[PDB]
Curated annotation (Swiss-Prot), chains A, B, C, D:
It catalyses: L-lysyl-[protein] + acetyl-CoA = N(6)-acetyl-L-lysyl-[protein] + CoA + H(+). One of its GO terms (molecular function) is aminoglycoside N-acetyltransferase activity. This is N-acetyltransferase Eis. Disruption phenotype: No significant difference in terms of intracellular survival in U-397 macrophages and in an in vivo mouse aerosol model of infection. A strain lacking this gene induces more TNF-alpha but less IL-10 production in primary human monocytes than wild-type. Macrophages infected with a M.tuberculosis eis-deletion mutant display markedly increased accumulation of massive autophagic vacuoles and formation of autophagosomes in vitro and in vivo. The gene is eis. The active site is at 119 (proton donor), 391 (proton acceptor). Its main location: secreted. Its EC number is 2.3.1.-. The keyword Acyltransferase applies. Gene3D superfamilies: 3.40.630.30, SCP2 sterol-binding domain. It comes from the Bacteria. Effector that is released into the host cell and affects host immune responses; it negatively modulates inflammation, macrophage autophagy, and cell death through redox-dependent signaling. Acts as an acetyltransferase. Acetylates 'Lys-55' of dual-specificity protein phosphatase 16 (DUSP16)/mitogen-activated protein kinase phosphatase-7 (MKP-7), a JNK-specific phosphatase; this leads to the inhibition of JNK-dependent autophagy, phagosome maturation, and ROS (reactive oxygen species) generation for enhanced intracellular survival of M.tuberculosis. Can also acetylate multiple amine groups of many aminoglycoside (AG) antibiotics, leading to their inactivation, and thus contributes to drug resistance. Is also able to acetylate and deactivate the cyclic peptide antibiotic capreomycin, but not the other anti-tuberculous drugs isoniazid and pyrazinamide. Acetylates kanamycin (KAN) more efficiently than amikacin (AMK), even though Eis seems to bind AMK with higher affinity. Does not acetylate and inactivate streptomycin, apramycin and spectinomycin.
Length: 391, 391, 391, 391
């Protein structure tokens, strides 16, 4: 019907659509807390009267390679009523928000995808990889070389908020994929930590000066401990926390949603005991401003200075010069040496996907295999890309 | 009791131990064919009279980064009788074969591990990663950018041996992890292709000028096609074969044991449809001669010349200079800048594991983070490491 | 229609009824081998022309407490056509065979029951207990006290028939529940040992001078080894064989159908690792001649001489005197002190069930609790009752 | 760090360790009620400041054969923080409590084991056997001989506390394994009887003058009734209650955790319908004072007077004379005829395990098989050993 910024009167209608669209809907109280991260004009609704479509973005701070922090539009709360499918409501809402996001001066937008087949056509590429490890801790023995053969304390999460906040803040600034976690999201996290009748069990924390793990026993599998979050600033902290987790003698299995480069398997005499049980796209990126994004991040120092011409499909053509870990990215009408869709650049941006891999799928086109190797090396992240928290 | 090279009289006793030790035992006829790959003095047995221990190596040819082919001792048929456990028979047999392998002039030994917790202590490190992808082909749609939007033929494997041989030979020479597949292993492969009463179903082949896929419907899950092997020399061949496999309209799912950098997910509009259902160590490497191995392989051209001192624990100390994609590796008593166990070098050698990841687990020790980045970049493989065939 | 001893012409019709009645039917060749154990007049058929009912008994030798061996009628191959149910054919056939068995001079009849609710009314009581133990052998560690901390050999069963025969013969004579295993059943056992296409895997043997285990990997669960049979004459042999079985390092689990008093759990540091996964009635006994049966077996020496009057319902009344491990059992019309149905006496006879337990269910009636304790102690078996082989 | 009796200030720290260690943790309110059973100096904590280890014992009254009631130290609430494993904290805490328990004058200590591989080395032997029976009540028909072919009432548990208390008190005094159930544990039991939102369903009671059953429908399997507790003083009460339970016509299955000698199967025309679905060690015993324990219990009258010399490993050597159902147990330096570890004596003490079975595992050593038979008969319990309630 019409596409508008919602009034205060629209939010009950938005909560109804949310409840009907999201099985994990956090409820009106929690949703109202997350609103404090939505700027003025950060939300659109379609009315037919009742809300049949909604989408918004939150003001986020995303760490990219080089420990550079970018202002980031975090898309969220995106729903079309089941009564109004195949009516181009998602396309209309995504076009309006992208317009507002671009005009506001955000260099990147980000989201978590409900399905993998939807956001590629709006220029979002999967930029981090979720990697679930399940450890059969009954067989787990630490390698002779593993650090810390206690510095770790078993604590109530709500009693050590200050220490978790300070450790997380250090973590998010040093890791590509890191997000600033504002105070309202700490309020929400520590509320979810407590037990619920017929719901999740009590959360516990393992606290080190340079890391923490939040974990809870699974609702139904009482021999599975699920680590909701492990933030370690040092290798010593990461090993110490895993020694403590393998010490949960009443559990058969410890599971964590981590990143592909988690060193956990190498801490054990049997690397195979850390089984990959699940893999999925994590954070998705849409590069809003190609030159601003490419100039902002740091590049591998190991690759020698090189120049090329990059065309993003309907996204501009640029003279790209990378040397001394920095990029210069300027307008040109010179012949393109590399072509890709905007989504592909998003997938390269945090170093989670190799240019060579995307080239092999013809998502990235060049006639120079030397240029491909140089892109691969340059866009690689020294610190492996991790996922911060879902939004 | 005693450790000897087996006589012809010992092989029936070895087949009994094999049958009792290996649920996948290929049987005496097939085992006798695989013997033709075992050199004179390539086998040891422990007798108590009956065979209570055995181990052997086969003469293999392994492709490493730089399209360099190394003579490789492939350990196989390693068994201790259940009556003679915890008697140091494995250690005795592994020490004797390694002695023979080293003296024979092999720069590397390789194996497939029955368990992950066993071969690390004998200096084997996991060097390739098996990555099972399962595609729900009912939802699978190819991306607009994907090549070849037919060059592929559905054929009987036994009728196109010459073409499979020629395609495989091109594949194995261009890919790190590639093994020469001798004639006896082609005889064995095409025998396993045929249907067995109460066994596997008939194997089919999809044949392209520059690639093939061997597949069969699963024994019990009649909606699952299992790709036993897909060898593609070009991206066009890889895409064409996957278009054909997604055309198996009577199947719900196509599964393949592939490598982490398989571009398949990027060929689809929904990358998530190519689900990682399983991950395990593939080929394990023991570097027998550190300087011969390190000098033999090619290194990334992107990293500028650098020099360091590498100590392998009880494996020598070496002045290591890497530049122009080549390494020089000479004896030194100069202070070590990098320390690691022999197994760790095996894990780095084909580029499947990052020095940075192993350093984070303290399996690789240095005080210079710049040196770590340079090792990471140098040991990286341009062509992603794949697994050839199990032995 | 009519009840007759079958002619040679009837056996094809009997094999058809067998095939249709028994999913485990051994087939006409094996059935013809088992016939050699059926005496002249050991079989009845009901014809309607076609066979609609059959039953037979084999000449067996059953060991009872005191190492006494009784001639035993082993009922088997009992079937009523699905076309002729609820026509009293089973009752007619059981009455005729029991008549022949009694007149032939057998003191006891025995069977394995297809269902638990059928044979009680014909005077059969469950006399042995099948107890399946499943060991998670990955955690299994032997106790410091366990014997034999090798005497055991891994062998092909067919190559050591003489040794298995000799060990079994010693076992069956010393254990209540022991059956003589004739030559035709050894022929049949060693034929079932070999692998079958789309059937069972190859059987292996662990051979000690004073015991053997026959085992095979499960058809479908390739991490489960099933022990079909373990016959140990000494505790040393039993422990040595279990050390070897726990040495099957490619298995997660070892299962055995054993007896409730199997000492296996006490050999381990964690008794709980030997899990009871299944329990069922094994051998069923019908006491044909009460005085002959009661006088034949040995009794506990620990109980002092006592006298009572036992009435079996429609089975006679007897003055029963037990002292010095022997019983005298003579006719009397004196008042009964103990009453029970014939089936209950069968359940007491091998010591598998306590008189006190059966009394608590009112299956055994007396007004003297002292008499109950004395029966309990007297009928107890020093050597625990085991099950020999199914028939 | 240090091992102390806890102050009131320590109990919040103990509740945190409890919550993190025990998935079935009863919560601080219930735990505070169970404290009333812990004597002054009945608890130890290890502090590192925070609680990293705890253990306590409760004052219990345990019935042993001969209807003799022993003061019993019931170990419970035993936990080591996952941060402080493999630091000998359990050994230190168990040594201190055993010292206090011995000095206080308890002849026996008892516990329920979280795992089977832990308490044997501290002298605890499994002394009762939990036996789960599952009845498919749709097929269940009572035998002609079964008593009571109504005396039973369906009631709300909270309304008949006095009658349950009085029946239980009669039960616990007449059965080996019986525990006095104090008022606080009746308060706790009847609170657990009520329904919980997203928790257990409402409990019902079947009440007979001489027995009760407490049962509830399973949370998730709505065709399974679980009997939490059935206490029957007479066989008539036991049968009447089972007739009522088989009358739960909306259920497919009735399950109960009972003892191996439960007469239930013998009440049915098909004994096989009472399936053993689970078997585990119940109560564990550590004999603190060998002579006090052995002299306290009654022995079988059926065995004639005999004398032997018993050595408990690091537990004393004793002249043991058993006659007229009583034992005299005095110091001696005479040659040992029987040797066993302390844990083994615990396993024999309530008659749940036969000396012959433990001898077959070499956990009990003698050279006289006649002595073995006499021990077997003497330590046997006339009334079968049952399990009271878990602690
Ligand atoms: O509603 C959102 C975004 C929140 C997305 N959620 C995504 C992730 C979360 N969760 C988890 O990660 N595990 C959970 C289990 C139960 C419930 C929620 C879980 C929580 C948030 C919202 C609402 C109103 C706004 F203005 C702006 C935004
Ligand atoms: O026995 C071997 C090594 C073969 C290892 N196998 C390892 C891998 C194989 N397989 C598969 O990959 N899938 C299979 C399914 C059923 C049976 C075998 C399968 C086949 C070979 C041997 C025997 C005698 C020698 F002298 C030297 C060596
Ligand atoms: O047919 C019988 C009695 C045999 C009863 N069976 C009962 C037990 C056996 N089996 C097992 O124990 N496991 C088996 C697996 C597959 C097939 C058979 C199995 C084998 C025998 C027979 C036939 C003709 C006669 F004259 C007299 C008697
Ligand atoms: O915490 C204990 C011992 C209690 C052991 N539990 C063991 C057995 C029980 N349970 C069951 O049997 N089924 C249950 C289901 C849900 C919750 C508890 C269940 C309850 C008690 C304690 C606490 C403080 C003390 F001072 C002294 C002692």
């Amino acid at each position: 019907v019409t596409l508008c910024s919602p009034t205060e009167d629209d939010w009950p209608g938005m909560f109804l659509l949310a409840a009907a669209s999201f099985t994990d809907f956090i409820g009106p109280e929690s949703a109202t807390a997350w609103r404090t991260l939505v700027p003025t004009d950060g939300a659109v609704v379609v009315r037919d009267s009742e809300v049949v479509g909604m989408a918004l973005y939150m003001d986020l701070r995303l760490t990219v390679p080089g420990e550079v922090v970018l202002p980031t539009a975090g898309l969220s709360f995106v729903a079309v009523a089941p009564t109004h499918r195949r009516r181009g409501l998602l396309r209309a809402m995504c076009a309006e928000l992208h317009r507002r996001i671009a005009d506001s001066g955000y260099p990147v937008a980000a989201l978590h995808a409900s399905e993998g087949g939807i956001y590629g056509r709006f220029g979002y590429g999967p930029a981090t990889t979720l990697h679930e490890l399940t450890v059969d801790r009954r067989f787990a023995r630490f390698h002779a070389d593993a650090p810390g053969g206690s510095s770790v304390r078993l604590v109530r999460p709500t009693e050590h908020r200050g220490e978790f906040e300070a450790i997380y803040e250090r973590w998010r600034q040093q890791v590509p994929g890191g997000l600033l976690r504002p105070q309202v999201l700490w309020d929400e996290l520590l509320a979810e930590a407590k037990a619920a009748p017929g719901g999740d069990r009590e959360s516990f924390a393992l606290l080190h000066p340079d890391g923490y793990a939040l974990y809870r026993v699974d609702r139904t599998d009482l021999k599975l401990a699920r680590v909701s979050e492990l933030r370690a600033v040092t290798a010593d902290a990461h090993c110490a926390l895993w020694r403590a987790l393998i010490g949960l003698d009443s559990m058969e299995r410890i599971s964590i949603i981590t990143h592909p480069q988690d060193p956990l398997p190498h801490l054990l005499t049997d690397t195979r005991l850390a089984r990959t049980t699940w893999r999925q796209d994590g954070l998705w990126l849409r590069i809003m401003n190609v030159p601003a994004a490419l100039e902002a991040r740091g590049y591998a120092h190991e690759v020698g200075e090189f120049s090329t011409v990059l065309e993003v499909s309907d996204g501009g053509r640029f003279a790209l010069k990378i040397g001394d870990g920095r990029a210069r990215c300027t307008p040109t009408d010179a012949a393109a040496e590399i072509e890709m869709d905007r989504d592909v650049l998003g997938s390269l941006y945090l170093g989670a996907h190799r240019a060579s891999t995307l080239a092999a799928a013809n998502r990235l086109r060049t006639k120079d295999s030397q240029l491909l190797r140089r892109l691969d090396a340059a866009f690689a992240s020294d610190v492996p890309v991790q996922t911060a928290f879902e939004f």
